[PDB]
Design an enzyme around this catalytic site. Structure first.
Site, PDB file in Angstrom:
ATOM      1  NE  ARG A  76      -0.250   3.261   4.317  1.00 15.43           N
ATOM      2  CZ  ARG A  76      -1.430   2.634   4.334  1.00 15.43           C
ATOM      3  NH1 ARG A  76      -2.309   2.809   3.357  1.00 15.43           N
ATOM      4  NH2 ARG A  76      -1.781   1.905   5.380  1.00 15.43           N
TER       5      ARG A  76
ATOM      6  CD  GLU B  90       6.370  -6.645   7.618  1.00  4.78           C
ATOM      7  OE1 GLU B  90       5.993  -6.972   8.771  1.00  4.78           O
ATOM      8  OE2 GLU B  90       7.352  -7.150   7.056  1.00  4.78           O
TER       9      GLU B  90
ATOM     10  NE  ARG C 264       3.428   6.829   4.565  1.00  2.67           N
ATOM     11  CZ  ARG C 264       2.964   5.744   5.177  1.00  2.67           C
ATOM     12  NH1 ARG C 264       3.497   4.548   4.913  1.00  2.67           N
ATOM     13  NH2 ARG C 264       1.960   5.845   6.045  1.00  2.67           N
TER      14      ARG C 264
ATOM     15  CG  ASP D 185      -0.414  -0.237   2.510  1.00  5.46           C
ATOM     16  OD1 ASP D 185       0.828  -0.225   2.608  1.00  5.46           O
ATOM     17  OD2 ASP D 185      -1.178  -0.552   3.452  1.00  5.46           O
TER      18      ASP D 185
ATOM     19  CG  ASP E 265      -3.570  -1.768   7.455  1.00  5.20           C
ATOM     20  OD1 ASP E 265      -2.401  -1.567   7.125  1.00  5.20           O
ATOM     21  OD2 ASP E 265      -3.914  -2.129   8.625  1.00  5.20           O
ATOM     22  CB  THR E 266      -1.263  -4.214   2.179  1.00  5.13           C
ATOM     23  OG1 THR E 266      -0.064  -3.436   2.441  1.00  5.13           O
ATOM     24  CG2 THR E 266      -2.007  -3.641   1.003  1.00  5.13           C
TER      25      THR E 266
HETATM   26  C1  LIG Z   1      -3.485   5.760   5.255  1.00  2.00           C
HETATM   27  C2  LIG Z   1      -3.082   6.795   6.293  1.00  2.00           C
HETATM   28  C3  LIG Z   1      -2.107   6.506   7.211  1.00  2.00           C
HETATM   29  N1  LIG Z   1      -1.663   7.468   8.099  1.00  2.00           N
HETATM   30  C4  LIG Z   1      -0.647   7.128   9.125  1.00  2.00           C
HETATM   31  C5  LIG Z   1      -1.322   6.351  10.266  1.00  2.00           C
HETATM   32  C6  LIG Z   1      -0.166   5.454  10.799  1.00  2.00           C
HETATM   33  O1  LIG Z   1       0.783   6.288  11.461  1.00  2.00           O
HETATM   34  P1  LIG Z   1       0.921   6.004  13.056  1.00  2.00           P
HETATM   35  O2  LIG Z   1       0.904   4.458  13.432  1.00  2.00           O
HETATM   36  O3  LIG Z   1       2.185   6.686  13.434  1.00  2.00           O
HETATM   37  O4  LIG Z   1      -0.305   6.723  13.806  1.00  2.00           O
HETATM   38  C7  LIG Z   1       0.517   5.081   9.470  1.00  2.00           C
HETATM   39  C8  LIG Z   1       0.037   3.752   8.866  1.00  2.00           C
HETATM   40  O5  LIG Z   1       0.728   3.655   7.617  1.00  2.00           O
HETATM   41  P2  LIG Z   1       1.326   2.200   7.317  1.00  2.00           P
HETATM   42  O6  LIG Z   1       0.170   1.113   7.221  1.00  2.00           O
HETATM   43  O7  LIG Z   1       2.056   2.361   5.919  1.00  2.00           O
HETATM   44  O8  LIG Z   1       2.348   1.807   8.322  1.00  2.00           O
HETATM   45  O9  LIG Z   1       0.302   6.214   8.583  1.00  2.00           O
HETATM   46  C9  LIG Z   1      -2.285   8.660   8.153  1.00  2.00           C
HETATM   47  O10 LIG Z   1      -1.949   9.512   8.981  1.00  2.00           O
HETATM   48  N2  LIG Z   1      -3.302   8.942   7.301  1.00  2.00           N
HETATM   49  C10 LIG Z   1      -3.710   8.062   6.344  1.00  2.00           C
HETATM   50  O11 LIG Z   1      -4.690   8.348   5.632  1.00  2.00           O
END
Ligand SMILES: Cc1cn([C@H]2C[C@H](OP(=O)(O)O)[C@@H](COP(=O)(O)O)O2)c(=O)[nH]c1=O
Ligand SMILES: Cc1cn([C@H]2C[C@H](OP(=O)(O)O)[C@@H](COP(=O)(O)O)O2)c(=O)[nH]c1=O
EC number: 3.1.31.1
Lengths: 135, 135
Positions: B35, B43, B81, B21, B40-41
């Site tokens: 992103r 890992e 991102r 993702d 949510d995929t």
């Molecule tokens: C998809 C998305 C993720 N994020 C943040 C939430 C998570 O950060 P935190 O855990 O620090 O709160 C992280 C998840 O991305 P990943 O699934 O790539 O790890 O990216 C956003 O802030 N807004 C979004 O719309």
């Protein structure tokens, strides 16, 4: 769609593949870009470029153990890339690229030329066999 | 092989593969990491991780035309991102991952959730078909 009240799609393309003599690795807990010592591959968009990138990729990503070896001279170029010989399971990527006729020997500078003759030997053999850039 | 007066080999490793993702693209003349909104995929190292990454890579890298579409709220997350919906020949990558049970709907925040109902419909079908994550 044209509505200004709704979302808008914009074009994107793929990022160009990295050239064969640039090697990105995880080193001492940080991502780092290395530029291979003593070699010059074509760039990806020129003939043999994709082959040099694919050969480096295959060597590096299939390795059980990758190592990094600086020479005695400058450790980083003006672009902040680490200047190194890189090994994949004991086989030097710089030498292998030249042996395959995917890179020429180049950038031979004082203090950073320890493996010069090994690489010239590889090049002579690649040329004798009219491989790739020598074809 | 032993002299400490010559060169030294140090360890290095590969940079870990990107998750399904996250998508890196050339956008308005510069590389940018995106992103995917609303998904949510797993890992890469968890079950269905490699599948999610391969599914996205196939969809995006075989597309004739890639598009990006920001929502109305936050344009980038705290990691820098771009938060977007990504399209490959008019098919949304976000929706497609979810539809194949390779990602769950997640991170749904009011104001950056234009395609919520679309994606939740895709998830219901993936779950109904007991696909992948849902098997
Ligand atoms: C998809 C998305 C993720 N994020 C943040 C939430 C998570 O950060 P935190 O855990 O620090 O709160 C992280 C998840 O991305 P990943 O699934 O790539 O790890 O990216 C956003 O802030 N807004 C979004 O719309
Ligand atoms: C391999 C190597 C390259 N370089 C520099 C020379 C070129 O910079 P300049 O063009 O500014 O002179 C460039 C070529 O690398 P690339 O073939 O990756 O482009 O990297 C060194 O300075 N030392 C070296 O050992």
């Amino acid at each position: 769609a044209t509505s200004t009240k709704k979302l808008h799609k914009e074009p994107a393309t793929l990022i160009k593949a990295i050239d064969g003599d640039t090697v990105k690795l995880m080193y001492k807990g940080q991502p780092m870009t290395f530029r291979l010592l003593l070699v010059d591959t074509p760039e990806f968009n020129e003939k043999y470029g994709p082959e040099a990138s694919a050969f480096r990729k295959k060597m590096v990503e299939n390795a059980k153990k990758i190592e990094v070896e600086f020479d005695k001279g400058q450790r980083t170029d003006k672009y902040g890339r680490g200047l190194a010989y890189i090994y994949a399971d004991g086989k030097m990527v710089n030498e292998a690229l030249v042996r395959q006729g995917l890179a020429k020997v180049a950038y031979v500078y004082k203090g950073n030329n320890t493996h010069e003759q090994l690489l010239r030997k590889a090049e002579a053999q690649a040329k004798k066999e009219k491989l790739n850039i020598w074809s």
